[PDB]
Symmetry: D2
Subunit: 391 residues, 4 copies
Amino acid sequence: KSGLGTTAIHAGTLKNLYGTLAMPIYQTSTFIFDSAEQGGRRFALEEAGYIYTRLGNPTTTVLENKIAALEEGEAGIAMSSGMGAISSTLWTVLKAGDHVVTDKTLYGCTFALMNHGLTRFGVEVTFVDTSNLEEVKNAMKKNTRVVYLETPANPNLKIVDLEALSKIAHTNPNTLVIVDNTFATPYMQKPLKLGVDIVVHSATKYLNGHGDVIAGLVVTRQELADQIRFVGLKDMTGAVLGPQEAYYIIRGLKTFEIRMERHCKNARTIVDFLNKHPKVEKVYYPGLETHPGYEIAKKQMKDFGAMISFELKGGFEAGKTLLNNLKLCSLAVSLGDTETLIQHPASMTHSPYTKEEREVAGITDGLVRLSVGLENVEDIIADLEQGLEKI
Amino acid sequence: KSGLGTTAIHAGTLKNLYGTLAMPIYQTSTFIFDSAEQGGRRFALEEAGYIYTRLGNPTTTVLENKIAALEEGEAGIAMSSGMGAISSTLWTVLKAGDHVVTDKTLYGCTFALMNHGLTRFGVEVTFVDTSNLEEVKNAMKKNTRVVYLETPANPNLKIVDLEALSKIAHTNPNTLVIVDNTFATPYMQKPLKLGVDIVVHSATKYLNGHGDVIAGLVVTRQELADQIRFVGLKDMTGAVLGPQEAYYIIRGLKTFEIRMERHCKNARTIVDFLNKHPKVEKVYYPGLETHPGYEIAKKQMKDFGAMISFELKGGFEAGKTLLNNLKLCSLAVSLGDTETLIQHPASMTHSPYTKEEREVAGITDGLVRLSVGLENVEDIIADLEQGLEKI
Amino acid sequence: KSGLGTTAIHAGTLKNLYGTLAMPIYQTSTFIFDSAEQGGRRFALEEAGYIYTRLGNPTTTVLENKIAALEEGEAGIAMSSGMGAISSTLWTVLKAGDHVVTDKTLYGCTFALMNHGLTRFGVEVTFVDTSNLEEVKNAMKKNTRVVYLETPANPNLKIVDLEALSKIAHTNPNTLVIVDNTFATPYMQKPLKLGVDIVVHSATKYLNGHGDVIAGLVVTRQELADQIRFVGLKDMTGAVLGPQEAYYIIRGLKTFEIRMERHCKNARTIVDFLNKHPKVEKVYYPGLETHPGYEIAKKQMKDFGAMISFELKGGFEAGKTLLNNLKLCSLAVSLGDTETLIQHPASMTHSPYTKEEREVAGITDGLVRLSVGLENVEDIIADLEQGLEKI
Amino acid sequence: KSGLGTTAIHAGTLKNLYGTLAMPIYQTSTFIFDSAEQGGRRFALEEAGYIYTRLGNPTTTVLENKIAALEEGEAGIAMSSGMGAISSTLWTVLKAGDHVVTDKTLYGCTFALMNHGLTRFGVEVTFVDTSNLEEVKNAMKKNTRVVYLETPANPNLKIVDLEALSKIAHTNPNTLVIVDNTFATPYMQKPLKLGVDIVVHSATKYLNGHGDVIAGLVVTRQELADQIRFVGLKDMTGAVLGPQEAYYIIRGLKTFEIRMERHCKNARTIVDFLNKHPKVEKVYYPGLETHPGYEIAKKQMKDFGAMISFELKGGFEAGKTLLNNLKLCSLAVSLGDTETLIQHPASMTHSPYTKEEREVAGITDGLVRLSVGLENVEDIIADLEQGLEKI
């Protein structure tokens, strides 16, 4: 078995006519046929090859094959955002009258899709604490079609047991388990090997890694993949990845192994610094023995990630003061970029909401979320240290 | 009022820091804030500027403003395909229990979304002949939320009266009229000026014009646009246009006026050639006085388009023989490219279906669809002429 | 013979493995061999195919073939600027001890290369008035290796007789005639058909047309082309065109015919407006019967171009006042973009120089240079008219 | 002082109007002025900002600043190939009658430029063994304008002492020392800190790192940089980097530190494997204590690189047999890509030449050149091992 760097670099490649080393950018909408009969054979699935980029594209196929190889699944599908991957999947496999079990701690736009979108179209959704196996067992119904999971998950890097939850879900023979593996990536976690049916990613984050593409990826069995491609993507979302962006992500994947290694190395060192810092009252990190679900993280994750959240003891003003004094870390949403990113949800993403509303949503006044980048760790720590001195 | 070329070239531009002549390609996922407070102000809609490309991007904003200016609507939204524009719109404005009135002659993937997708999620859809005003009146119900129209529409370039249909739809105060204006483009037809509520496009076709981008556009009133952006696009499709592709379309729009002029000039000359040709039994073209709805086309279209369909008197084998002998026209799906494209649906797109099934779908054995390109018309005609000689 | 639009759109295409309609972007540095022996055969020129993008690239080859087809020459070479095309050519064909005959009215950077660059490396250069055939005859020497010409040429759109000058040059069997055909383009002028040996272009201007690429092109006989490629480009300039930029230019060429037609249509109408305007004392345009060399322009140009210069009777302050009040025309260097561009050399490009110095260089205080774009001509004229009212 | 990763990621950034995280791609030829007077001020160097991409471009400026920061020099200049960087520099600083001292072991195209190009234009060139300090001292003349060096250099990874050679060169007050630092990169070697005047790179190799760009970079003092920009690049080569390619290289530099670390880690392990392998008679690697100049390499290089050459004891047929059996390593020219590349010069690049001719050029029948990539080292070694078994 080839190593992960070898796989990220080489897996899934397709031939080209000129033997270019780089994967060509097939920046095309349509494809020409040699004859009427060849066109007919492609539409009848009797001959291999391409028709139209919304259906598939050779640049995109390489990307799809690569992510499937990394997750050790049968088939990949690419979309023009993580929400495109998630929605295309859900619109394919659900119908009015179906039921979904999921967590309240889900990526915000996914929560909105679940709570306000799917429910408008006749889907029943129950939100439970998926760290409580009994709650999940009790929420299962005959018409549960999807159990949707995310681990680690915002804002406190909650860990849930994918293998155990999948066994519970699969007591109903019609239930699919879908996992958003964005934060962990296939460098750390391979949900399909734990019995999950479908993996989804925001490739916008670590997989691309360079903060320049919005994209999503799905990995699953061929039978399900073909439905997600030819129903969800083709007709119900149209979230078609641009060939240029497919190329950018392929290119980003050339450094995926070494980026993830450095992200995690940096992060573990920063966790130790923050957890020993007098102005930080608590650190949320899956690799701390004091983190809830540490033992689950240790079983299902090869490393503990490069996201860190932490609570400043000085609360709201401490969060703003820290961030406003940083010179290296960048104030922004998103994660998984080569540059370190940081946000203070109480003053930034959750500015429309009262303290009470924020706290109901798990956002505390001193909570800071850090996406650790690839800078020299001494420089990231020096920046945090000087900022913390100002509180 | 500026002319259409002036508008396509100059409308909607945003400033950049360096005064580059070309619109910069803001190939970014995220945006940095100067302070925590600035981030908060953007999330609270208290300060202008950007957050994250799925929400909006400055390159994409220029494109959005341009198409809104061309359609003479308030607001534009861009997506990563025409189906992204269509689906994002429909998921925003519909809910389970709503009803839709539309035509059986709709773009195939839209038909599939209507007939198999929306119906799975509790939406009622009635397909009528929207060229028959009484049929449309009779299909209206209290819960009709959308009347969805397309003109000219495949495979016989059917014309329907947008102004008249919109008046019928608007007898219900909750009904929105949505028009797919892809074929006509704002060079020929501006549905919002006829009382339509929302215009959608596959920018993959004429607007981009260069056969290298999959993209969609929506134009509507600001109130509706903001919902389509922040609900449909943000959460329910994630069909986020890549900044590179946004740039390609802006670039394509620099020649939109002159491309459409040449497309139509070429097409009218080719229509005359085909309609007088002994091996062609019938031509479908909105500008022929013998075309059904010619008088409606004359009222609502400034020119009659660059799509032509025609029936070869020799049927199925004549279609294949013609196409297999062409040297300039390219055998492919799609339309609106600078290169002339041609397809024979009976042997190509509809190869999975029996003659009976095809004929029920309006596909006759000798039907050929031609997307007239920008080549010198003498060369396009010479190619068709030599191909027709082989039948 | 195919028309110019057909040729621009279709000529020079290469196959690709997937039959994409758009030319793939082979964004690669290097190319892989199937075997050691295949690599050897390519290096020994025994097998066709690619090695490394500085030598050649399939995307770039299409562009090269297209410009060669448009100029009706044997071979094309692409570079990363017009100055790259010019310098690569000159470094290939010259040596210390050679002589060059050229005009003082040459593109400024070419003049600098001739007067200050080549002369530093042992090349003798004589600058004459190439509109005076006797001056050119008298400048010829046994060691004259290049006669370098440009028509129309800045700042007064000087016309020189390419066929006549080439006959004079070719009285020496070792002399090559090189023409910068940027302004005229192959839509108007095909110097190789008049006996010229090498044509050079700044593709930055009309050929790309979209103000987003810096690039150069050369067309000549295969024997000379191979030397320019494998000596000048390979080793002496390294002015290697990026595959992305090659694609942009191919894409720009899809509309070359219709762009040039509209550029010239607009320009002729604007010339009439300016030449009849009371505040304009003189117009420089090859198509005016009062222009020097009008009859030569009529013989060697199919149309008279889209560059216009004109003298405002109010001089220096009138130039600045006009330009500072324009709202549609953009203040910028360059030409041949879809947007109308304008400059006042006395206050802009020639700001470092005294009135005396400027006038020696042919720059008069009221001289304005206009690159007519593709906007609706009524809008361009309205903008100029309101600006002229302010003088 | 910030670490090298921090510097590569963050140095040299310019602001943009929207605070995009990624550097915008200013894919423009020209720049617009607010007024005639602003244009004049820019041409008179009285106001900062841009004019035209051949002169400079904001995307490219970021790249230039980054490489200058990495080399710890004052100013950077970018070109569209390494040969563009080299030639632009040489044409700027030389003139007919000048003399150059350099090595016979120079990159092949540079050797050709020196031996056949510059000599055609009146420059005297002496080729010496620059590992012999006395030879270099003896070659110095009053008119020596350039001492041009390269270390490590093909085909045996020759090492020369940059500090010592620079002292010899600088005994003539008019002599500039130019070093091609491509192989070593600023991760290993910073020639300006050793007294060198100008550093040149093929950014095509490690700096970009992703095998998808042809580009060059120069770093030197501001006074020299401005001459190379405004003479060499502007007029004498026109080797203008495309903004897209500038962006690709900036993007590549985000992972420069971690890529170089893994390249070298992999390479050192492969050197040990090859040097102990019974079918390999000799390994050329700067870090072997048996390599000539090992002690010089240890003084001027922080690590010993990721290029390896080696001699197979079985000669010509062994080279071909090895390469023809490899499944992971790719047969190609170039180096510094994320993928491992390999070549056998005797059968590939030097296929036109006899054994005698090859051996005079230092190419021996069993010589193999390996550019070690970023794949898992166990996989690279397994591939080499199985290939070596076939000899």
